[PDB]
């Protein structure tokens, strides 16, 4: 069963920090993972939720492009998972287009999205932090 995980962070302030994401895709014999900048650094449009959605979108885009289908996708954002499952409304103007992109991807992938606690999402967390550190080192821009 293909399982992907995503995460996003925004530090050292939220909002107005550096927003990064990370994701990991588990296949039985190999792993593919990704991490990066979600928004322009220190911009007022870097937010935690934008970062989380960006990690989700990049995860599902990567899956789609690789020909993965019917994955299970796990994250530790209750808000994002509940929005993606039709259980919380999306009303924030900057989240709406990201939610829409993610919903189209979820439909195309026949993805199932479930919440797990933070301590079960450590790899994707770690990768969002690696991305953050890389931005601080001028290695992602």
Residue numbers in the entry: 1 to 141
Which statements did the authors publish about this structure?
Ribonuclease HI from the hyperthermophile Sulfolobus tokodaii (Sto-RNase HI) is a monomeric protein of 149 amino acids. Sto-RNase HI is highly stable, and is stabilized through the C-terminal tail. The C-terminus of Sto-RNase HI is anchored to the core region by one disulfide bond (Cys58-Cys145), several hydrogen bonds, and hydrophobic interactions.
First, we investigated in detail the stabilization effect of the Sto-RNase HI C-terminus, by measuring the stability of a C58/145A variant lacking the disulfide bond, and a ΔC6 variant lacking the six C-terminal residues. The shape of the spectra was almost the same for the wild-type and variant proteins. The root-mean-square deviations of the Cα atoms for the A and B chains of the ΔC6 variant against the wild-type protein were 0.446 and 0.436Å. In contrast, the ΔC6 variant shifted the curve downward and flattened it. This is the result of decreases in ΔH and ΔCp.
